[PDB]
């Protein structure tokens, strides 16, 4: 439980990046620590509607295998409804790269 403001955060960037990261970690629990490769990149052209669903999803990354599998794993991941307006304003058009997760 890292909270929404532990000291002076909520607009530093890493807070929003953490919400992007929550999807990254979710993807591993849909493959294994198999998703935990290395030396790869999987830029995904995604668009999350306010209802918490990806209307757009296109692999534009650098690894065709990682990206091909990522499409299915990400759809099986748990992504909540965008709450905070700042996060929502980004999530509605946040094409994120999904590479080997920590």
Q: Cα–Cα distances in Å, from 46 out to 3, 8, 54, 58?
A: 26, 30, 6, 7
Rg (CA), the chain: 14
Nearest to 52 by CA among 9, 14, 25, 87: 87
Tokens of 9: 């955060």
Experimental method: NMR
Query: What domains can you pick out in the chain, each with its CATH number?
Result: 1-102 (3.30.1150.10)
Nearest to 48 by CA among 39, 40, 57: 57
Nearest to 53 by CA among 24, 23, 28: 23
């Amino acid at each position: 439980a890292e909270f929404g403001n532990t000291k002076n955060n909520g607009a530093s960037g890493a807070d929003i990046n953490n919400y992007a990261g929550q999807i990254k970690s979710a993807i591993e629990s849909k493959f294994y620590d198999a998703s935990s490769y290395a030396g790869k990149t999987c830029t995904l052209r995604i668009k999350l509607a306010p209802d918490g669903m990806l209307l757009d999803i296109k692999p534009e990354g650098g690894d065709p295998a990682l990206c091909q599998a990522a499409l299915a794993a990400a759809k099986l991941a748990k992504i909540p409804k965008p709450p905070s307006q700042a996060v929502y304003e980004v999530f509605k058009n946040a094409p994120l790269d999904f590479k080997p997760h920590h």
